[PDB]
Structures are given as structure tokens and as C-alpha cells.
Amino acid sequence: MALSKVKLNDTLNKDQLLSSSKYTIQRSTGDSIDTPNYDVQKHINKLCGMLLITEDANHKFTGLIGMLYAMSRLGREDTIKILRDAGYHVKANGVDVTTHRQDINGKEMKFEVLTLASLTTEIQINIEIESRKSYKKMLKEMGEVAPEYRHDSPDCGMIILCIAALVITKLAAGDRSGLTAVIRRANNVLKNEMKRYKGLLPKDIANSFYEVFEKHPHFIDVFVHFGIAQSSTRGGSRVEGIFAGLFMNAYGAGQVMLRWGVLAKSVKNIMLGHASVQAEMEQVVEVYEYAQKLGGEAGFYHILNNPKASLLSLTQFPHFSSVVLGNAAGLGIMGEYRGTPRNQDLYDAAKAYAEQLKENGVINYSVLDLTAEEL
Amino acid sequence: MALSKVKLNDTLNKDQLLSSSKYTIQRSTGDSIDTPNYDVQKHINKLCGMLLIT
Amino acid sequence: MALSKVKLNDTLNKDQLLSSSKYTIQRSTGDSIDTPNYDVQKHINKLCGMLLITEDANHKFTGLIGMLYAMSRLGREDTIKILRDAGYHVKANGVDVTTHRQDINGKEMKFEVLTLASLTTEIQINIEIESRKSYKKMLKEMGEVAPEYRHDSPDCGMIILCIAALVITKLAAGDRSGLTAVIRRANNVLKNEMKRYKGLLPKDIANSFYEVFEKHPHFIDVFVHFGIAQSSTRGGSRVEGIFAGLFMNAYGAGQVMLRWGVLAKSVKNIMLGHASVQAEMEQVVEVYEYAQKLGGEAGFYHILNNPKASLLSLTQFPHFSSVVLGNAAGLGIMGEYRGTPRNQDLYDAAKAYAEQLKENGVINYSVLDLTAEEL
RNA sequence: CCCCCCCCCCCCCCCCCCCCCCCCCCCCCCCCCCCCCCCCCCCCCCCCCCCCCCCCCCCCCCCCCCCCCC
């Protein structure tokens, strides 16, 4: 009645404030950005392949090249549009294919290159030279190169962007610490591809992507939205199916704590009954309902650095955090998770009860009814 | 009442995200694709038969 | 029935009055104000860096320069618009980049400067000279300067505005008394940045900002709204994520008393039952509901000096104030808080009961039900 | 007057899938009887009868409000 009516909604208040700014900032990204159009797309995918067939390839530029493929999928107009939507001033840089004439080994040669701010028509021909070497050597070994082994395969563009997706997976912690998790998965999920391409080195590309995301942080946006627009797709090659599968493992990065909450609720961990956890409840519901109201776009809040993401934190509730993290310890899902309970006693109690829960599965007969049962 | 109300819909959330992309990709299939019209149809069916009697 | 129907709503009445003025005041801010546009933004961020690489830099002008960065983000038109919305007459001052020619050390040199009312093209070149010194010295020490160490890093603008945000955090008390709290946090939260920049002195900038807010109090508005518009953002660098995180710690400054109320309610502190606290209840609900109705924009009322902020005070209720402040004492969250209970007996009673509450966590089983439990 | 505390967040694991299988099959038109309907008696009506009728203006006292604290 009298005091139980006094409360303050802070989580939703804060959203409401950020949501309703009457003014906007705009960032100046850099001097140029290349916006490759649909028409260059095949050529980029071709350049991607060249790196994949090259054994022990230099993967310095693979991060950046991948982003170029993603942008040539989105297309010149759509790509600019997502940059302006994120808020950055864009010096758009049109991308044309031109032929270059240079004497490699004395003899003069032609090359297919792109006019790129970010990539010298030098370091380009160098990938094409290096590829040809790993290719004539490949031709010698098997006699004739199969289509799945060449740089033509329509998958090459997407294959590269696969480990890119995996990078997004672990970009939650902010540092390079995912890298060993990234290689580990790339090996099981992508093992088939690694067999067709000697240049598919997980460690090296994953680093080249981490590199391009840390350095140019606006790309992380572009990629996330490309990834969405590619997952919106109606059909596609098994590799685009893999891409989307992985990309979607990254929905909800940083909010692990949240799902583990739903879990603690689902298993009916007893430590949720505790008085000092019951005290937080009112607010913890606020936030869960906030996540609900936010919907889909919410999962990617931690990966892009969307300010509003702080709001989803369950950290602000130490007692609940502790029983939820405990529950997830006792069920053996946490670790090597570097989260720390703020309440050691509760964590221990919840871990304890949770370990006991997996022991005894009691059958519940009031979920499904039957008018005659002999047993 | 209190905890049994806390949940997160993830399956439907995810759909809702993919469904509502504001941008789109477009793939470059190959150099050509043949799009035979209605008017060639009988001839194609004929070519099909040829393989079936052989 | 008869007397229990007589009441007067004063809190909501007062709001309703202020909300519905039919006339308006307009203040004359000063002779000029510079409104840098989007197009100068990179240059300002560059000038910011110069101060951050300079070891033992003079941070007198850093307060004002920070505000210039924020205003070049908002953009010339948006910035003016928020000034007129706050109500101040604006002598808008357009900002152009021009080259200056001056002989430093005998030899003649070029400089990139801005035409600024608030900043002499003298004191500008002086930051650029000082930076170059700390830079060639830096070049000597490590041989080659990494990108995270230069004045180019896109973060420099925002990094500076970070301690600015922290200043807003503690601007609740009105005086310089936050300053030691400001340095303390800047050191843990920003420790990584302080490693990349020898010119990131928390004490010195924080003072330079306090300075520019006390002196030109209209900027405090501009900054708050920039801060909102930057937190509205969709994505961003880890540093813009930090910025927003801190900025939002300042939502609800001055209304600490209010949240501690919700707390006293949440823990069911017994002293809320007391007769003389029950007597205030009717009004205390009025105010809590007022805060609810006000919503998001309400949190920043104390930081800007929004008159309407007096209304949120729980001071006008001594008995409730005292049990709420007591509760927060007994739970060890207050201190070194300089709030005084107006009722010593109630404060002591509530502190007492509150200390006893953390002792015994009694498990409540009627929140979650189960059709069969053996234990 | 009001205000005055502490405080970024974040950190795990992980694609997915994989079986079997066309369908269908019976029987069979429907209907068929009886039978127009109706038929009586019967205008309606009728009396008595204007309404109204008293008394009556109304009003009349005392009184500005307000004052603390913050």
C-alpha cells in the first residue's frame, strides 16, 4: 500500500533519455574509405582466393581485404548508408578495375588491380605473384587442379569472412584473448575448408581481423550489419550457411551473465529465495524486461560499443550476480570464465545446491495427464 | 510471481533481428546464366527424351 | 471518508506551475561564443592529442578546448540549437582553419591554427611547439612512435572528455570537493590510457574542466546534451564506450537520497513502520511519483541547475530522511557522505536494525513453487 | 535553498545436419402416393357534462484577507 508503491525505474529511465536525444554527434573517420560496388565483387573474391591457395601466405592485409569483400556485397550505396547511420562523415572512394603493366623477372606482364586508398597496386600484384607460385607447385603435385582447390571457387570471399565471424564471437572481452578459442573452433567447424586451401591459417587471419577492428573501429559496425544482411538471405551455399551459423553464435556476447540467470530460474536453484537476493529482485526484473523490450538489435550491443550496453549489466546486483554465477559453476558450465562473485558465501551455497541438482532427476507427472494409468 | 516472470526470448528475438535488416547483400553468380523462355520449352523436353531413350 | 479525503498536492502543483509559464526569460551569455562545425573536428582532436603527448603539459586551456571538441561533434547548427533551447542569446562565431607564419628559433615556420574568440592563435602554436618537444624526446626513447602513442589517435578528443564526464559525476556538491574522487577513478578506469599518454594528468585537467564549468555555466548544459547525443550512438570505439559508461554514472547525481529510499523499502527496514514516518508517507509518495512522471530527463536536473530539482528533495521530510539515511548507514554504504539526519533517534534505530539485517539471510520458499520436494 | 557516498563495462562453451516413405484401388444415377380452393352471422351508432371562484410580494443578522519556519 504506502511504501511498497515508492520505487524509481532507473534502467528504463536511462534508455528513455538516450533514445530521445534532440541532437547528434558525427565523427570524422579518416581521410578516405573505399566503397567497392557490386561490380567489383567477383574480382575481390578472386583476390581472396589467391591468398587462400598461397601456402604460408602473408595475412597482414587479409583483415582489410575481407572488409572489402563484405562492402562489395553490401554494395556502394548500402555500405555508405550504414556508415552515415552509425554517424561517421564519409569520404567515399569509388573503386575501379584497371590493368597494370610491370616487368617481373625481366619480362613485362599485365595485372588486374583495383584503385584503392587502403591498398597499393604494388602490394596487390604481390599477392597475385605469390599465388601463382603456390599454384604451379599445386599443379605439379596433383597434375590438374580441381575446382574446389582454385582461387575461383565462389566460396573464397565467404570462407575468409568465416574466421572474421569467429573473431566477432570472442570480441566480447575486447582484447586478443579469444584467439586460441578462435583457432580451436575454426579447426573443427572449418576443417573441410582447411583441406582445400593451404592458405587458410586460422591464427594469422584471425589476428589480421582483430587488427583491422581495433585499428578502424567503424568497420566492426559495417561487418555486423553485413553479417545481418547476409543472414537475412533466403538461400545459399553450405559455406554461407556456416558463415551465418557462426555469426549468430555472437548474438548475445557480453550478456552471458543474463542467460545464466534464466538458467538459475529454470533449474529453480534455491539460493534465489534468500532474503538479500529477494531485495534486488525488483530491479533485476526491470533489466530483464528492458532486454525484452529492446529485442533483436540488443544482442549485438556489446560487440559494437553501444553505450546503452552498460544497462544490461547484472553486475550492479552483487547478490543475484553471485547466486547466478554460482549456479553456473555448480552445473559446470563456467570456467575458464574470468567473472568473480561479489558475494563468496552465496556463490558457494548456490554452487553447492547446483552440484546436488544434477544428481537426482525426480519425474513430474502433473505436466501430462492421463485418465487411466495402471502404473 | 517474482523470478518466474524473468525470462529472455532468444529464438524469436533472433528471427526478429534477421527479419528486420535495413540493408542487403547481393552476390555475383558467374559470368552468364541462361534463362530459357516458355517458347523453347518443348524443344528442351525433346532434348531430355533423347537422353532417356539412349 | 470525511477528513482522509482532504489533502493538497504541492509537489505536482508546483511542477504544473513551472511547466506552464506563458512567458520566457533569455540570458546574454557573453560577447562571443565559438561554434566549431563538423569540418574542423579532426583538427581539434589533433590539438587535443598534442596536449596528451606533452609530458607535464599546461592544462589551463584543456577545459575550454574539450568543450570545443564536444561542440565540433554536435556540429555548428545543432550546438546553436541547444543554446537557444536553454535560452541564451548567441553571438555565433564561425571557426575557420588558417595557416600562420612565425619565426621560432630564428627560422620561419608554418602552423595550423583556428580563428577563435576564446583562444589566441598565439597560445595555440605554443601547444604545438611544446608537443613537438615531448615528441622528438618520445621518438628517441622508443626509436619509432606507435600509433597509440601519437596525437593522431582518433581517441584523443574523447579521452579528454572522459575526465570531463567524471567531473560531471561529482559536480553534484557544486564545489571542487569531488576532485580527489575524480583522480581516484580516472586512475583505475582510465589506467590503460594514462600509459599511452604522458600528458593525461587527472588532477590538472579535472581542475581545468571544473574551471570552465564554474566560469561559463552555459557550457555545462552543452556538455550534458553532447553527452546524451553521444550516448544515443549506435556503436563506437572502446573509449567512446568508456565515455558513455562514466557519463551515465552521473545520471541521478544529487538524488542519491532517493535511491537509498527505494533501498530501505527493498530491505523492509522496520523503522518505516513508525508512526511519525507513516505521517509523512502520503507526501513522500507524491514526490516519488513525480520523479516517475518526469522520467529520463530528471536524472540530470541536479547537474544542470534546473530549478525544478528542489522538488525531488526528501529533506522536506525529516523523519523519513532520517530512517533512509540510517538504513544506508547500517548497510555501510554511506560515508564519507556529509548528509545529517534531522532525527537522531530514528537514524540510530534504523542503523541498528539495518546492521542486524546483513547477519541472517532467511530463505523464502513461496517465490518459487514445486509440486514435489523431498527436502 | 538545495546539495554532499561508492562505482565503467566486459571475460565460458558451441555451427548445423544425418531415418523411412509417392499416391491411389469398393459400391452406387434419381425418381415413382394422395390432393385446386372455397361455402356461417354480422354496418356502425345512441348517456350525462364548459371552465372557474381562497389567501400572499419580497426583504431585513455578523464578518475583508492575511501573519510561522525554511
Phi, psi (5° rounding) for residue A217? -80, -10
Q: How far apart are CA A113 and CA B10, in angstroms?
A: 44
Quote the Cα angle for C226-C126-C113, to 5°.
Answer: 60
What is the torsional sign of CA B16, B20, B23, B24? positive
In Å, how far are A219, B23, C236 from A225, measured between CA atoms? 10, 7, 14
Phi, psi (5° rounding) for residue A63? -55, -60
Q: How far apart are CA A181 and CA A170, in angstroms?
A: 8
- Tell me the chain C residues in contact with residue A82 when contact means C-beta distances shorter than 8 Å: none
Phi, psi (5° rounding) for residue C256? -50, -45
Q: How far apart are CA A277 and CA A306, in angstroms?
A: 29
Nearest nt to the CA of C245 via C1' is: D8
Would you list the DSSP string of A5-37?
T-----HHHHHHHHHT-S----EE--S-EE---
Q: Write a three-state SS string for chain A.
A: CCCCCCCCCCHHHHHHHHHCCCCCCCEECCCCEECCCHHHHHHHHHHHHHHHHCCCCCCCCHHHHHHHHHHHHHCHHHHHHHHHHHCEECCEECCCEEEEEEECCCCEEEEEEECCCCCCHHHHHHHHHHHHHHHHHHHHHHCCCCCCCCCCCCCHHHHHHHHHHHHHHHHHHCCHHHHHHHHHHHHHHCHHHHHHCCCCCHHHHHHHHHHHHHHCCHHHHHHHHHHHHHHCCCCCCHHHHHHHHHHHHHCCCCCHHHHHHHHHHHCCCHHHCEHHHHHHHHHHHHHHHHHHHHCHHHHHHCCCCCHHHHHHCCCCCHHHHHHHHHHHHHCCCCCCCCCCCCCHHHHHHHHHHHHHHCCCCCCCCCCCCCCCCCC
What is the torsional sign of CA A97, A99, A103, A107? positive
Phi, psi (5° rounding) for residue C204? -70, -40
Residue A352 beta carbon within 7 A of nucleic strand D: no
Q: What is the DSSP letter of A290?
A: H
**CB-CB contact of A90 with A29 (8 Å):** yes
| Elucidated via | X-ray
Phi, psi (5° rounding) for residue C343? -135, 100
Q: Which residues in 285-304 of chain A line strand D, with CB less than 7 A from it?
A: 302
**CB-CB contact of C158 with C237 (8 Å):** yes
Q: How far apart are CA C339 and CA C325, in angstroms?
A: 8
**CB-CB contact of C88 with C26 (8 Å):** yes
Residue A341's nearest CA partner among A250, A266, A268, A271 is A271
First CA to last CA across chain B, in angstroms? 74
**CA-to-C1' distance for A68 and D50, Å?**
112
Residue with cell 581521410: A31
Contact (CB<8Å) A226/B10: no
Work out the minimum CA distance from B1 to partner chain A, whole angstroms.
11
Q: How far apart are CA C375 and CA C373, in angstroms?
A: 6
Q: What is the DSSP letter of A220?
A: H
Q: What is the DSSP letter of A286?
A: H
Closest residue in C to A28 (Cα) is C42
Q: What is the DSSP letter of B28?
A: -
Residue with cell 523499502: C265
For C246-279, b/e burial (b = at least 16 CB within 10 A) is: bbbbbbbbbbbbbebbbbbbbbebbbbebeebee
Residues after which a C–N gap over 2.5 Å breaks chain C: none
Nearest nt to the CA of A334 via C1' is: D12
Strand-pairing partners, residue A38, are none
Nearest nt to the CA of A259 via C1' is: D12
Resolution, angstroms, 1 dp: 3.6
Strand-pairing partners, residue C102, are C109
Q: Which residues in 186-205 of chain C line strand D, with CB less than 7 A from it?
A: 188-189
Q: How far apart are CA C294 and CA C279, in angstroms?
A: 25
Q: Which residues in 283-302 of chain C line strand D, with CB less than 7 A from it?
A: 302
Question: For residue C100, what are the contacts with CB-CB under 8 A and spacing of at least 6?
Answer: C110, C111, C112, C113, C121, C125
Residue A169's nearest CA partner among A186, A155, A152 is A186
Residue C259's nearest CA partner among C310, C317, C333, C348 is C333
**CB-CB contact of A302 with A253 (8 Å):** yes
Residue A332's nearest CA partner among A351, A314, A318 is A351
